[PDB]
Amino acid sequence: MEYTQLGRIGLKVSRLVLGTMNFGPTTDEAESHAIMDAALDAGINFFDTANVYGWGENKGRTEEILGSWFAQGGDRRDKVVLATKVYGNMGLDGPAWPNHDKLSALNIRRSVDASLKRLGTDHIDLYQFHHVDRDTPWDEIWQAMDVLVRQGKILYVGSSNFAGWNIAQANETAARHGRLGLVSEQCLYNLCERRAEMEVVPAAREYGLGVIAWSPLHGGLLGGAIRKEQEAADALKDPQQREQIQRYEDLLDKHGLEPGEVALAWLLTRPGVTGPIVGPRTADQLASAVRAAELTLTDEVLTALDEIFPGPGPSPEAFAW
Amino acid sequence: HMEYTQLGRIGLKVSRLVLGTMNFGPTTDEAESHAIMDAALDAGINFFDTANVYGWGENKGRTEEILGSWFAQGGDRRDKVVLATKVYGNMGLDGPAWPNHDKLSALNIRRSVDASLKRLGTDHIDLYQFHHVDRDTPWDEIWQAMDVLVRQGKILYVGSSNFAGWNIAQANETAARHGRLGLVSEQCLYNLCERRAEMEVVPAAREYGLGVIAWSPLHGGLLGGAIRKLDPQQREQIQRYEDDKHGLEPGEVALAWLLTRPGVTGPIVGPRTADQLASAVRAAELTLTDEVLTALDEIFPGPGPSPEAFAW
Amino acid sequence: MEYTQLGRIGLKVSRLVLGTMNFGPTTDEAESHAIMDAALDAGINFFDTANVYGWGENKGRTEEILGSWFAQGGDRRDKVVLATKVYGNMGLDGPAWPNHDKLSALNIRRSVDASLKRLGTDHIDLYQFHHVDRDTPWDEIWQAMDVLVRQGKILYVGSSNFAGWNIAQANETAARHGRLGLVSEQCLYNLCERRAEMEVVPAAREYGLGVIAWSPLHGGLLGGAIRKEQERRAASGRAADALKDPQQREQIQRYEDLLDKHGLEPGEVALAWLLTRPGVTGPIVGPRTADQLASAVRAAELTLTDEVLTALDEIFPGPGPSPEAFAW
Amino acid sequence: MEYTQLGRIGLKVSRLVLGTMNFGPTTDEAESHAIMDAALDAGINFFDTANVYGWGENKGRTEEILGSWFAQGGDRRDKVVLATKVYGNMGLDGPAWPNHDKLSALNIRRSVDASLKRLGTDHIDLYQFHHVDRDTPWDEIWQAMDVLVRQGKILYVGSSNFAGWNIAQANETAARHGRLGLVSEQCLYNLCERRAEMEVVPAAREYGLGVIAWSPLHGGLLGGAIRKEQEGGNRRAASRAADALKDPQQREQIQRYEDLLDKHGLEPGEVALAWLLTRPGVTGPIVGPRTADQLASAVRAAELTLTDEVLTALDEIFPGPGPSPEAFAW
Amino acid sequence: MEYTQLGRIGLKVSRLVLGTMNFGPTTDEAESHAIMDAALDAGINFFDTANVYGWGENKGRTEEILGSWFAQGGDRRDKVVLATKVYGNMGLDGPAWPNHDKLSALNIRRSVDASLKRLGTDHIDLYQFHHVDRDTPWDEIWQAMDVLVRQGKILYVGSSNFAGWNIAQANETAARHGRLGLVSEQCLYNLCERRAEMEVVPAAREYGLGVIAWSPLHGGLLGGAIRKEAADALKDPQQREQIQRYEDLLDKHGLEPGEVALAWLLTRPGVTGPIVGPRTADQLASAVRAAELTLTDEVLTALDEIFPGPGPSPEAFAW
Amino acid sequence: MEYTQLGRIGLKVSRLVLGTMNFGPTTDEAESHAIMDAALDAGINFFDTANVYGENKGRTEEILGSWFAQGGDRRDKVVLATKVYGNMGPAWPNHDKLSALNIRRSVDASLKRLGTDHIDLYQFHHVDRDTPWDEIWQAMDVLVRQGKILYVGSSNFAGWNIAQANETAARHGRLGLVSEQCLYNLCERRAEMEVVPAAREYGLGVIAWSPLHGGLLGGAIRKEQEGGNADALKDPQQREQIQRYEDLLDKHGLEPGEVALAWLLTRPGVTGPIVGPRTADQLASAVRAAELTLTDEVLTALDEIFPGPGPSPEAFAW
Ligand SMILES: NC(=O)C1=CN([C@@H]2O[C@H](COP(=O)(O)OP(=O)(O)OC[C@H]3O[C@@H](n4cnc5c(N)ncnc54)[C@H](OP(=O)(O)O)[C@@H]3O)[C@@H](O)[C@H]2O)C=CC1
């Protein structure tokens, strides 16, 4: 298994990040524990979850399943870098009660509290914002994170679904008063959606953040979608995206490569990318993700992939000069 | 149903009505207070204002005790409310305080928040407010004491009440020097009869991004139907105000008028019945015409900002 | 009773500070308790003690006597601003085991924990360095004090037996990172010893520290020691050595004669004088009896005339501030 | 016993530092306790240990031996400046599991908690990085140490096996935000290996760190190793490690050393220690007695006064470099 | 001509730095002028000088030659990144009058004004400390350099012959009060002398300084010294043997010693480039060829075994 | 000639400081110039003057100016120190003391008289309790940045003034005071209570003025007994100190004036004494005093005769 520093910090993580979103709604408790044991066996030490995972009435269920996993002992907690998230509404689906979503110091205090209890652990290694909150200023956010840092309840802070300039503002404000800033950004990044390349990834590289790609298969659209319908994806409605996926599936047919694996290995070549979040439901899907991390894509396949799935390049050049 | 706003520049979202709490104890009883709070919650009011001195005399603290009773019932009550209380007041025998048993020394702040947390039956206050400026305590002392509480998780935010504008500036410049969040709100005396917050308090609050909470929004009930059930000048000002020509109830218009003022978060309302609360709710939905605002401005003129209020 | 702000900070204190050094080695526990009750009854809210007080094998006795006073209830702890000290050796008298005296963060951690236990309280209001430690830098000291402030174990930090430039360096270092600095300096200052006037008091005034004067009667020398010489702290220590030096002896003789003539008591005048000195918060009185405490209270109501102030200045000239004190 | 301040800070330490490496592997629990009690009686108040001490499956055994020492009472914990270390892999020897070695905030947090539990104490006086970690930035390290300071789990932070410029960067970063920086550096420094003089000791002195010399006898090569080879007579026929001092350049240095010391009547183990005590900016050497007898010998080396003739001749045998840049440029 | 950034800053410099030490005491005005025009022609934009160059009673002569060169117009001044130095005694050789050497604000002020006058220009681009001064604190030094920056007499500050920790202290002090720190360090670094790798180069890399290698041929000892029979170190059998293995190997691969020593430096991590000291047009052309040379990995490997480096501290002496 | 760093900074100065106050009517312009050339010849590079030196105020600075105008590298070799604070005209408001207004006009008048474009060391002549340091540092920082001055020094400060000044300077990157001129000699040692300990903490040079205590340490009892024309020689106890001092020096064959200067050079943190020779034989006597080595026996005896106070707080408390 390949390891890398998470951006600029001393933390070392697996380039494959185990996502936990399916633990609860798809795989049951014991099945999820087995997948986590097997991720560990393959050397994956980086586990991403969220308070909202579980969905609907079951929000928090994913954290509970990792909690019972840690409760089996055998150094599981000691060995994993535990990441979870704050921002999302934990009450009834629909419009949240005020301050029961987003990034106020008040929601941060109550959110991390409920996460620690469901996770059955006394600390979170990587506490991430699930989305930028334009209404909370960074001196409030860093006050609330710093309370947690100094109680030993969290080690590191990261973001998800930020703009590039939010990364810059967040870390400049942290650095002004001697605080470690964001250590990582979780952005939607895959062959079909490359616009994090304009500004999010350049800002992250500048400020030394790890870049973790969520929806690395674009919701399955890059995992052999077309071949599976012959045996969201309202993209296979639009014939331009459909023809794009077709050329992709055809291209990988002639190089003998699995699309679900190629999509992951492609992200691993991109400058600044720490790795994709993989969400296997079975032992075969985990082993396939591991193979994707050992794949070496030829220049030939990389060039043709860029021809099918062009990227915008960095701003300002992407739209001006 | 209820209108919400950010509290000044910060991430906290509050209802534009602030549930006052001073009646709980003296006027309404524990059972009636509990039921008004349950009602406020169901109308969407999340912002409750209280003070340690509330209850008065030998009953100072009774109000905080009543809110603790309410929280102890469970049912997401503590979780749903932005709880604001106050420090400054003597909690001992009325009359001259023993030294450091009132005002804002780090010593009185330590003893006040401990006694407030115990009576409130909660491990934290969301918004801990100075009841009054203390000219004798410097801001590096006050911010030390508040930072001890912030870092213990005992409080989240700091607000002020009865500050001058320049105290607001000094307090927040001092906090920002060393990374700390400053005052997030100022609770000032603001209503149609008393507009001198407009000279400097409200302008400083808006420059520093504080929410403005208006206490005594009906000027002691003088703006809520007085001569239609104290003087020769005061009466005929109110009489022009209380003149049906436009079809509106005075008490609700005094609240709604404050909601039009730039920088104002909302007023502190103090309902004693669920029907008074339902009126306050409608006050927050009212739209006053450019008509009625221009006329209110001639009955109750305001000073404007300094320096123009008194120079040019 | 007159109250004042302690220097620039919001803490209000009585202009008389109750000293406790006598409680244990010269005044027993029960009468210590009576004096403290009388002090509280007269409006004195500011008590000074030290870990070392008690002396010898009884170092810590004074704190323990304060502890059992608080334990009697009646709001005593809540009403009193409690000050103690760190620096002194709490082990066997003589050369200290390394880091069991002075102001390292290590001695600070162990010293405050033992003080809180002997005082039977969870916080000290005013925690004072007993003496400057030239070997500990201020970033180490402010680290250790800041740990205590953030845990709630102390509120304020003060100094004792500092030079003026130590006050400056300390508070400039604290302010650089937004810490409240020293709030008070407890220095030797009385009619017989006025050299804190050169730099310590000017620096304290500049930086807004309170100034509380220790041994305000010079160990009882200024309390009628000559009249009382054959019948007591004045029979020992500072006072007794001063009485054997003829010039100091003469100074005190002129002092007791001047007060005989004006119908005033020496102990009370010595305290009243300190109360006139600019920047002085108050003297730390050292009653051995309840009588002497009621006497200090009378001192706090005395008004000295210009005539008396000028004659005292003639007997007990002071240097005034540096650089003028020794240059121009 | 001679005391000194540890660099610029208020902490006072004996100029002999009691190393504990041999407690567990070569000395057993009860003799380790007796050595620590005899160190205290000689005035030594400065104990240096490490989480890794113990070796192999027994990593942490040394910290446990100190813990049972402290648990005897008698003001033992109160009298000792306790130092330990973080950086080393505490699991099975070999490649470490990610973040189970080096200086991430994650490993600092788990390493100190495990050391406090083994040491049977609620705080460490001097918590030292065993080695520079080029992959962890100083705002991450200082955040982790600052959490421990503010919780009261540690008092002072030190380094070991740093470059001079790591010392400067660490303490400049700490000073920016009012944090006390490194108070001490533990570098390899002895007659045979003097290259710490180029930049490590200069930087430590500029920034006011104490300098603690580890391996002051260069693994025993300055402790009379050549005489010790010809020691047993017939015992050398036994079925015994190969002799380790083969580099002829260094072997002749050691011969000249032992001859010089024979000429002047001095003990090689004592001189190596006392020499370090003359070097500018050095606090003291770490002494690793395996017996009460070895301790008395180190204590004698602390009271030894080396004549200027012997100091001159030792310098001729073991020349140091200058400070940089002069050592290699001008 | 290969260009690079000078460490972390926006200044772009050729990977060859034109030294001017020989201008005066070896080449005279007219020929140094030709060497400088030819350096411009090959794309070299980075000229290194010093106030002391010229030697003895001719100290300042080199700067005077650059001044007479710039006075010929033709965009010479505009095209060149001009670097000079302060620290050296500019008076009578031997013991210096107090404050007429080293880095006091006193010596800095008189030193830069005399340099500017001799260079015939109103600004120096890169003003370098010739050597660390352990007796002048960095708040004094940065005060003096900041005066020169704000008056527009200098743009960047650099160092020469610092220890690694001096680089760190210098730039941490500058950054605390909003000053650009050192942008480059000039160290003795070549195949024969690699101890800059212990700490100096690693500190420069951490703080983003360019690394300029001076005496890259070790006094000419690496430019074919034994065939063409300070660099007189040849007496020592140990080093003369290094040099013969060196010349022998490059004879076998068909390579010129003076060009390999330069090209080797261009492969070292964090190195900006060597300062070359041509006395003729032939030597400049040679250095240019050196900047174009690609050393194979078996030559770099054999050069390593002949000229081992220490590696970085602490590993170099401990672990 | 012995040199030293001026406190913590990179400036190197001779441990004798040539004062210019005693340039007067027994001292030509021409004889002042000769003395200054002789000082340069002896290796003294540190010249101290003041604007008020000279009702004929500024004349001293003018004499230095014409000295510099002779050329011969005189300006370039000398570390030139002058002062601001004194009235140069009861003073008209802001024509004395340390306001930015008086600093600006004083330095301009000083540079004109001195006939130079810069002062190396510009010193406050006295503490000004009414001007805050952020004002003072603004005005000095303007001069630093214009190149008109290099370093700032103090004179007749309290130790806590030194601390406050340099802490304030360092907050915003500025070089603080580099030197303090204080009254300091065997008879007056109270600068050891706080001034010198602060100066040493903050790394200032200490320049001792009135090093002979107005001549009291220059053999004043011998001169009285020899007959023919401050007086503490009427004070019995102060007289006995000076008598013990002159007896001690007679027994060891040492000159009172020279020993007073040599003693100061042994004191911790002292850069040197100001000397104001009116003749060239007085200068050579000062140079010999800087060469003298006082035995430890003599230094112990001088401490018995002239006990120091110790540092505060120990000086008066414990
Ligand atoms: N920080 C430091 O270094 C020090 C601090 N302190 C603090 O200062 C306090 C006071 O010091 P202390 O030396 O006791 O003070 P004093 O100088 O007042 O000496 C006390 C003695 O003065 C006499 N006395 C006290 N009050 C009166 C009165 N009203 N009328 C007449 N005589 C009186 C009594 O002498 P007699 O018994 O002879 O009648 C008494 O024992 C101490 O309690 C301690 O807290 C003290 C010493 C050092």
Side-chain angles (χ1 to χ4, degrees), chain B residues 72-83:
Chain B
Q73 294 174 324
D76 289 349
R77 291 178 164 95
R78 181 62 195 93
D79 193 52
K80 278 170 80 159
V81 159
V82 180
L83 168 58

Side-chain angles (χ1 to χ4, degrees), chain C residues 156-176:
Chain C
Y156 305 107
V157 185
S159 53
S160 191
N161 303 307
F162 272 27
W165 70 269
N166 306 133
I167 291 171
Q169 190 173 37
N171 280 28
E172 298 283 354
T173 304
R176 219 210 168 71

Side-chain angles (χ1 to χ4, degrees), chain E residues 140-272:
Chain E
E140 168 175 7
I141 291 167
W142 286 126
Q143 166 196 292
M145 303 312 276
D146 198 41
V147 165
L148 303 169
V149 177
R150 291 181 195 263
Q151 300 174 340
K153 291 184 207 282
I154 76 187
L155 299 186
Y156 309 111
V157 181
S159 56
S160 206
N161 311 301
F162 276 23
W165 68 269
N166 306 133
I167 286 166
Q169 180 170 44
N171 278 28
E172 297 284 3
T173 307
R176 223 204 183 302
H177 300 101
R179 279 126 180 200
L180 197 62
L182 309 168
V183 309
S184 45
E185 153 77 4
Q186 264 196 232
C187 50
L188 176 52
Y189 190 25
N190 52 62
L191 280 161
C192 300
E193 189 43 74
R194 291 184 65 177
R195 276 173 305 166
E197 289 168 354
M198 289 175 87
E199 290 217 31
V200 169
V201 175
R205 286 167 61 44
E206 169 68 28
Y207 284 85
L209 279 68
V211 172
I212 306 297
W214 70 260
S215 164
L217 267 39
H218 209 218
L221 174 93
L222 290 151
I226 311 198
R227 180 182 294 320
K228 282 130 106 144
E229 285 261 289
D232 326 301
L234 275 97
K235 75 171 210 224
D236 204 14
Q238 187 82 197
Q239 320 175 230
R240 198 180 180 299
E241 203 34 38
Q242 281 187 309
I243 314 284
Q244 254 286 347
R245 287 145 73 201
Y246 175 66
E247 293 201 43
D248 288 6
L249 185 120
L250 303 187
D251 274 329
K252 181 215 309 151
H253 278 81
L255 303 181
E256 219 60 60
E259 305 171 10
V260 157
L262 298 191
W264 183 83
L265 279 167
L266 291 167
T267 60
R268 303 309 293 152
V271 170
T272 304

Side-chain angles (χ1 to χ4, degrees), chain C:
Chain C
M1 167 79 48
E2 209 190 347
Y3 294 97
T4 191
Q5 298 303 299
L6 185 61
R8 73 201 185 279
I9 64 165
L11 190 69
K12 195 194 301 171
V13 295
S14 41
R15 292 259 268 148
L16 296 184
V17 187
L18 175 64
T20 63
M21 196 177 68
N22 280 337
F23 302 171
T26 87
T27 311
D28 64 38
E29 155 165 60
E31 210 205 354
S32 300
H33 285 189
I35 296 168
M36 289 186 277
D37 283 325
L40 215 58
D41 192 40
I44 303 183
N45 72 320
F46 194 14
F47 289 17
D48 184 66
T49 200
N51 57 356
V52 292
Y53 288 168
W55 303 143
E57 284 162 343
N58 302 298
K59 286 187 308 290
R61 178 70 182 144
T62 310
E63 287 185 326
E64 288 167 348
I65 284 166
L66 251 56
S68 62
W69 188 68
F70 293 136
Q72 294 172 348
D75 302 311
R76 289 168 167 78
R77 179 65 196 88
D78 186 56
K79 282 173 88 182
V80 157
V81 173
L82 169 60
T84 189
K85 310 192 179 74
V86 48
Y87 176 98
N89 182 25
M90 287 302 290
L92 182 44
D93 281 337
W97 182 262
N99 312 310
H100 287 193
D101 62 355
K102 312 292 192 37
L103 295 180
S104 69
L106 185 160
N107 193 35
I108 285 170
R109 172 194 181 112
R110 65 198 286 283
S111 291
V112 74
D113 290 339
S115 281
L116 289 164
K117 308 204 192 266
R118 289 185 298 268
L119 292 159
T121 175
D122 63 358
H123 68 293
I124 285 139
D125 298 305
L126 181 59
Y127 199 30
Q128 306 164 102
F129 314 117
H130 211 149
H131 194 283
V132 55
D133 173 4
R134 299 178 179 81
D135 287 315
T136 305
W138 276 104
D139 58 351
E140 171 178 355
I141 289 161
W142 287 126
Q143 175 195 108
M145 297 327 265
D146 220 50
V147 165
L148 299 182
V149 165
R150 267 132 202 84
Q151 290 175 343
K153 291 199 178 45
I154 72 178
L155 295 172
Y156 305 107
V157 185
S159 53
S160 191
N161 303 307
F162 272 27
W165 70 269
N166 306 133
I167 291 171
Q169 190 173 37
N171 280 28
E172 298 283 354
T173 304
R176 219 210 168 71
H177 302 292
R179 281 158 250 193
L180 189 68
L182 306 173
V183 302
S184 59
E185 155 71 6
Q186 167 176 158
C187 58
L188 175 63
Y189 189 32
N190 56 56
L191 284 162
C192 299
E193 184 50 72
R194 300 184 57 180
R195 279 176 291 175
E197 286 171 2
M198 293 175 82
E199 291 219 18
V200 173
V201 176
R205 276 159 79 51
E206 170 62 25
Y207 283 87
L209 282 69
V211 176
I212 54 184
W214 62 259
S215 278
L217 307 203
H218 213 57
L221 181 63
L222 288 165
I226 280 181
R227 181 176 265 80
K228 287 163 161 168
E229 197 168 13
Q230 272 86 26
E231 76 193 22
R232 293 194 301 110
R233 287 273 304 285
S236 270
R238 200 169 267 109
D241 302 348
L243 285 178
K244 315 291 86 201
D245 171 15
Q247 306 131 99
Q248 297 185 249
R249 179 150 198 118
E250 181 196 309
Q251 262 186 307
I252 299 293
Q253 190 65 253
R254 287 172 70 195
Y255 173 67
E256 287 185 48
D257 291 342
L258 163 72
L259 299 184
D260 282 347
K261 153 175 179 184
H262 282 86
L264 298 173
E265 309 288 356
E268 297 173 23
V269 166
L271 297 166
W273 182 82
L274 275 164
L275 284 169
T276 69
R277 303 310 299 166
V280 175
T281 309
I284 316 200
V285 299
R288 200 209 339 127
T289 66
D291 278 26
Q292 286 177 348
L293 172 67
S295 189
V297 169
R298 289 197 294 280
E301 309 158 342
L302 217 46
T303 316
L304 309 170
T305 62
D306 279 356
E307 177 187 348
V308 166
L309 292 176
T310 289
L312 287 174
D313 212 47
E314 273 158 34
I315 306 171
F316 299 109
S322 281
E324 293 85 356
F326 70 90
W328 68 271

Side-chain angles (χ1 to χ4, degrees), chain A residues 3 5 8-12 40 43 45 78-79 81 122-123 125 149-152 155-156 175-178 180, chain D residues 97-107 109-110 113 133 135-137 139-140 143 146-147 150-151 177 179:
Chain A
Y3 294 101
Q5 299 306 126
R8 70 192 183 286
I9 64 167
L11 189 68
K12 206 188 343 239
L40 220 51
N45 72 325
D78 185 52
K79 293 230 249 163
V81 173
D122 65 347
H123 66 301
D125 306 305
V149 163
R150 296 206 209 251
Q151 297 172 341
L155 306 174
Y156 304 116
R176 186 95 170 233
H177 299 290
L180 193 62
Chain D
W97 184 261
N99 316 302
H100 287 195
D101 63 351
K102 296 181 191 96
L103 300 180
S104 71
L106 190 161
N107 193 43
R109 170 186 172 91
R110 64 197 287 286
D113 283 347
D133 168 8
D135 291 320
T136 310
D139 54 358
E140 171 180 358
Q143 168 201 291
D146 202 40
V147 167
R150 287 185 184 287
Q151 283 174 347
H177 300 293
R179 308 207 263 208

